[PDB]
Structure 1
Amino acid sequence: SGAIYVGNYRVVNRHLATHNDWANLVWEDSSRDLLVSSTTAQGCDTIARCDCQTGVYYCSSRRKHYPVSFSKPSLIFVEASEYYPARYQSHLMLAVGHSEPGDCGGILRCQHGVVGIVSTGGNGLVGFADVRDLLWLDE
């Protein structure tokens, strides 16, 4: 559960995208687990334009926000799921912290804004799909 709303855009996990998201599709990237779609109401979230490696993420399965140190966006191997076969997912950031499948979509933030969304997890690790490079979300 969870999405980012910036201007006339809505970013979600591509594996959790709805029929409306696909019928108003702007861009989608299987290797990043991302999909952006068109909205009529204007969004108000600020996206970060930085290279921080500390922030705060929201965890639905614990109803608690947590502070984390996280890695730089890179190619990490992700286990086969009902949505994708075993593959390398690009632009992924890892941190020590609790996550369960229903937690995908929770936002990661630093003092500059929205950094990304929960996208992978397991064994006491949590993975975030980076969004700071998508400069067109602001224009």
Structure 2
Amino acid sequence: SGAIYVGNYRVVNRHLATHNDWANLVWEDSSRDLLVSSTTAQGCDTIARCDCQTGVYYCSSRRKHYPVSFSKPSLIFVEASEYYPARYQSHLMLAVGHSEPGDCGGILRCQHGVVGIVSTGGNGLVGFADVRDLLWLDE
């Protein structure tokens, strides 16, 4: 679990969105596993606007932060799950690092701010949904 709170927006994994997220829907994209809802309170987070390929992520299944080198956002095949059929997930970045399904929502950050959130993984890999291209989150 986990979310990004920037301005009057809450960014969550689309597969973990609540009934309240859907009732306050701003934008969603199944191919990216992202959903953004509106908030009444002002958020605590800053979004990175950069091309960093290193950063640090929070891993809830270890209660620890880990440094990672990750690939640029790209189109990657993801096997069928209970949430989605087998498909290509877009804007996904992979890195070597521990992850389990409940780690989805953990933030990846570089020195410029929030880069993305955990969305997939397994076998010593962790995959992050990028948010750096969503320039509208800042206004």
Q: If the length of structure 1 is used for normalisation, what is the TM-score?
A: 0.99
Consecutive unaligned residues in structure 2, runs of 5 or more: none
Q: How many correspondences in the alignment? A: 139
Q: Residue by residue, what CA displacement relative to the aligned partner does 1:65-109 show, whole Å, maximum 9, x if unpaired?
A: 000000000000001000000000000000000000000000000
SS in 1 for 2:5: strand
SS of aligned partner of 1:95: strand
How far 1:14 moved relative to its partner?
Answer: 0.2
Aligned position for 1:54: 54
- Cα RMSD after superposing both structures: 0.3
Gaps of 5+ in 1: none
Secondary structure, counterpart of 2:61 in structure 1? helix
Q: Segments of 4+ in structure 1 off by > 4 A? A: none
- Structure 1 CA distance, aligned partners of 2:123 and 2:101? 12
Deviation at 1:130, TM superposition (A): 0.1
Q: C-alpha separation between the residues in 1 aligned to 2:7 and 2:43?
A: 4
Instruction: Quote how far apart the aligned CAs of 1:44 are.
Output: 2.2
CA distance in 2 between counterparts of 1:74 and 1:89 reads 8
Equivalence map 1:1-139=2 (5 Å):
1-139=1-139
TM-score under structure 2 length normalisation: 0.99
Over the matched positions of the two proteins, sequence identity in percent amounts to 100
Give me the whole-angstrom Cα distance separating, in 1, the residues matched to 2:61 and 2:116. Answer: 18
How far, CA to CA, are the matches of 1:95 and 1:44 in structure 2?
26
